[PDB]
């Protein structure tokens, strides 16, 4: 009657920008100390894009989740049209000679679409911009797998609390995975600089003003709004106002 342990699920902090590497260091160590039994995942929370280039040079970094979408961009000879939908890229049309055509869809980091006569390719790869500075890990953590974390290469070590790895849910895990990979990510923004809003919270509720500048980064605004006839620039969050 075999019973496994549960492993958990930890939160490694990294050097930021090298996360990619944080978790290829990860699983060389992970092999050379022996210690693979012990870790069921090493995630990198970050999305997945196409990045579409054209002789050496990105013309295109576009999310692989979406709307079906056709991109052309000009070669070396003339234009190759990438499709991407359902999660996958591939090639609808190319030059004559391009056999890249019949290259199977593309969907996972590391793969890639090349055209040899037209020099453009479309390669997945993971973004970072979410959570930068994170590699997510599932396993049965010790003192010989600590220490062998602190000591990968580009890892400092696990968010600790208390002096322990702090084990994290499986549900927000999941969650905040599913979000990251499979959520939509709107058409557009919601406000646009110009646009006249009402504010529905806070001190300045019943107040209008004007969009001044957007930042969809934190869903924050700068909103022109008249205070005894002085315009006067508040910082508002999205769900703060309403178009009017």
Known sequence: QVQELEKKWYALQ????????????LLKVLELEGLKDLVDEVIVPAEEKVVIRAQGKEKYRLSLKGNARDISVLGKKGVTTFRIENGEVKVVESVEGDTCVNAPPISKPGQKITCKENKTEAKIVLDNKIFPGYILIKAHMNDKLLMAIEK???????????????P????????????????????????????????????????????????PEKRKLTVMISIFGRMTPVELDFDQVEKI
């Open 14 to 25: 990294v050097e930021p920008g090298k996360e990619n590497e944080a978790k290829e260091n």
């Open 152 to 166: 990968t290469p580009h890892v400092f070590r696990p968010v600790m609390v208390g002096g322990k790895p702090v």
């Open 168 to 215: 994290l849910k499986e549900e927000e895990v999941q969650n905040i995975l599913n979000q990251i990979k499979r959520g939509v990510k709107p058409s557009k923004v919601e406000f646009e600089k110009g646009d006249q809003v009402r504010v529905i919270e806070g001190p300045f509720m019943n107040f209008t003003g004007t969009v001044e500048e957007v930042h």
